[PDB]
């Protein structure tokens, strides 16, 4: 989900273009997708120090 803002007078894919870009600033892709299987507290903490710094995402 991107947002509640509506857009009309464009093509069908013009909406998806902004959907796929605005979905990045929401947890729909990270918060609701990481918690599919458990992660131990140690690895849970190290994952932040790894990703948020290495800029692998």
């Amino acid at each position: 989900m991107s947002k509640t803002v509506v857009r009309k007078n464009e093509s069908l894919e013009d909406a998806l273009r902004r959907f796929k870009r605005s979905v990045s600033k929401t947890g729909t892709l990270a918060e609701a997708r990481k918690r599919e299987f458990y992660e131990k507290p140690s690895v849970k903490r190290k994952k932040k120090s790894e990703a948020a710094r290495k800029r692998k995402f």
Binding site: M1, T4, T26, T28
Partner: peptide, 8 residues
Amino acid sequence: IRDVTPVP
């Protein structure tokens, strides 16, 4: 559209 999601 809406911004709804099950984000816990």
